[PDB]
Design an enzyme around this catalytic site. Structure first.
Site, mmCIF file in Angstrom:
data_model
loop_
_atom_site.group_PDB
_atom_site.id
_atom_site.type_symbol
_atom_site.label_atom_id
_atom_site.label_comp_id
_atom_site.label_asym_id
_atom_site.label_seq_id
_atom_site.Cartn_x
_atom_site.Cartn_y
_atom_site.Cartn_z
ATOM 1 N N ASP A 1 -6.274 8.409 -0.090
ATOM 2 C CA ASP A 1 -5.760 7.387 0.808
ATOM 3 C C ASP A 1 -4.509 7.866 1.534
ATOM 4 O O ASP A 1 -3.628 8.508 0.932
ATOM 5 C CB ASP A 1 -5.401 6.110 0.043
ATOM 6 N N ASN B 1 -8.782 5.372 3.574
ATOM 7 C CA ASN B 1 -9.486 6.211 2.600
ATOM 8 C C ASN B 1 -10.372 7.227 3.296
ATOM 9 O O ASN B 1 -11.071 6.906 4.260
ATOM 10 C CB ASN B 1 -10.334 5.310 1.697
ATOM 11 N N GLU C 1 0.826 -1.204 0.000
ATOM 12 C CA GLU C 1 0.000 0.000 0.000
ATOM 13 C C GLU C 1 0.858 1.250 0.000
ATOM 14 O O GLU C 1 0.561 2.220 -0.717
ATOM 15 C CB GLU C 1 -0.927 -0.015 1.215
ATOM 16 N N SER D 1 -11.701 11.184 -3.225
ATOM 17 C CA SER D 1 -11.182 10.801 -1.932
ATOM 18 C C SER D 1 -9.661 10.595 -2.016
ATOM 19 O O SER D 1 -9.072 10.453 -3.093
ATOM 20 C CB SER D 1 -11.855 9.523 -1.426
ATOM 21 N N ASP E 1 -12.607 9.195 -7.308
ATOM 22 C CA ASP E 1 -13.802 9.803 -6.742
ATOM 23 C C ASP E 1 -13.478 11.031 -5.896
ATOM 24 O O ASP E 1 -14.365 11.508 -5.187
ATOM 25 C CB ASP E 1 -14.600 8.775 -5.926
ATOM 26 N N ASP F 1 -15.164 -4.661 9.991
ATOM 27 C CA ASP F 1 -16.447 -4.222 9.455
ATOM 28 C C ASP F 1 -17.125 -5.254 8.567
ATOM 29 O O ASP F 1 -18.185 -4.948 8.002
ATOM 30 C CB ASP F 1 -16.272 -2.907 8.685
ATOM 31 N N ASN G 1 -7.796 9.384 -5.095
ATOM 32 C CA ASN G 1 -8.640 8.480 -5.854
ATOM 33 C C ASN G 1 -9.477 9.272 -6.845
ATOM 34 O O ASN G 1 -9.703 10.475 -6.693
ATOM 35 C CB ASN G 1 -9.530 7.664 -4.918
#
Ligand SMILES: [Cl-]
Ligand SMILES: [Cl-]
Length: 129
Positions: free
Chosen positions: A52, A59, A35, A50, A48, A101, A46
């Site tokens: 990271d 994110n 990562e 967003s 969209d 989650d 990103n």
């Protein structure tokens, strides 16, 4: 801060990630390698809008607030800048919420694509833990 492999493994172990929700330590190290290349200051935007953040590329759409991801949630209740610290504590505590989650470590694309189903133990081989 750019961690060494064994340095990061030991820090992750101390912060309670070894076998956290069943994921051995090598998974976490493998994920951080791919990562962020072990760099706490890594950021990547990103499509969209967003971003990271940090050693585990958490994110801003869902997990932290960067003030620029409209209609985002802040499920770890932290500014995203806290995820870039040389102290990995915030990244680890947020990672614990993510992996809990329901989708486990599949939340991290690099883990799914580069770690899942490989010999992840190799990532902590030779470290004094
Ligand atoms: Cl392991
Ligand atoms: Cl990937």
């Amino acid at each position: 801060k750019v961690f060494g492999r064994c340095e990061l493994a030991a820090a992750m172990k101390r912060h309670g990630l070894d076998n956290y929700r069943g994921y051995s330590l090598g998974n976490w190290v493998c994920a951080a390698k791919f990562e962020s290349n072990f760099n706490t200051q890594a950021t990547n935007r990103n499509t969209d809008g967003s971003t990271d953040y940090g050693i585990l590329q958490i994110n801003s759409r869902w997990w932290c607030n960067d003030g620029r991801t409209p209609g985002s949630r802040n499920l770890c209740n932290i500014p995203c800048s806290a995820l870039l610290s040389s102290d990995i504590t915030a990244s680890v505590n947020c990672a614990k919420k993510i992996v809990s989650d329901g989708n486990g470590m599949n939340a991290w694309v690099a883990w799914r694509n580069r770690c899942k189903g490989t010999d992840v133990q190799a990532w902590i081989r030779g470290c004094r833990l």
